[PDB]
Design a protein around this ligand. Structure first.
Ligand SMILES: Cc1cc(CO)c2cccc(Cc3ccccc3C(=O)N3CC[C@@H](N)C3)c2n1
Lengths: 39, 156
């Protein structure tokens, strides 16, 4: 049995850690909601 | 129960200790998370009960107490922030320029940030603080690293 606890406000924070790349990926989405790489 | 707008942890006590299974967003009295987090089960907020209202295993989304409310969209250009909420760790904004999932049905924003499974449902925001989708459904790439779709629902 499952419960929720508040964790913060939803706000854009100026000067947050900038990181991560921006890949363009060919993908398929199946009936079960699972993404896969089309190669 | 707690109905204040913001981001929330989704916890279970059905395993060892109190385990975070995911994350979600409270907006306009509706709780928004990913389907694989709850499997469509009821939630507690203190004494208050939260019952499912809408869900879709293919979109991997679910809303509680009312219809999906979040309708902002990635503009296709600007950087975004993942308001990551990892298990046991404070809420933390991570700014990134999304990549792209190219599918037969269209292109979707994707964010290449790796976090534990329990981070599923953490919101992705635009510069105006609007939630443009949730983190936690995506794909493992050549490297072994995770790319999440920016998953958004439709608002009726
Ligand atoms: C495999 C993997 C790896 C990593 C990290 O490298 C993940 C990071 C964040 C979030 C997920 C998703 C996740 C969470 C918890 C249980 C299952 C899944 C999962 O893979 N799905 C189940 C239904 C399907 N729509 C997605 C990650 N799944």
């Amino acid at each position: 049995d499952m419960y929720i606890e508040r964790a913060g406000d939803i706000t854009w924070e100026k000067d947050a850690e900038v990181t991560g790349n921006s890949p363009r990926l060919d993908v398929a989405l199946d009936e079960s909601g699972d993404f896969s790489l089309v190669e | 129960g707690e109905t204040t707008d913001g981001v929330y942890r989704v916890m279970t006590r059905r395993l060892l200790g109190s385990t975070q299974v995911g994350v979600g967003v409270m907006q306009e009295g509706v709780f928004h998370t990913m389907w694989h987090v709850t499997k469509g089960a009821a939630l507690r907020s203190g004494e208050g009960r939260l019952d499912p209202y809408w869900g879709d295993v293919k979109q991997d989304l679910v809303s509680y107490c009312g219809p999906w409310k979040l309708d902002a969209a990635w503009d296709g250009l600007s950087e975004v922030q993942l308001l990551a909420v990892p298990p046991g760790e404070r809420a933390k904004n991570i700014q990134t320029l999304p990549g792209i999932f190219k599918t037969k049905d269209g292109d979707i924003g994707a964010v290449a940030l790796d976090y534990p499974a329990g981070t599923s449902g953490s919101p992705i925001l635009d510069k105006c603080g609007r939630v443009i989708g949730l983190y936690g459904n995506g794909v493992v790439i050549k490297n072994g690293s995770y790319v999440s779709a920016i998953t958004q629902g439709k608002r009726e």
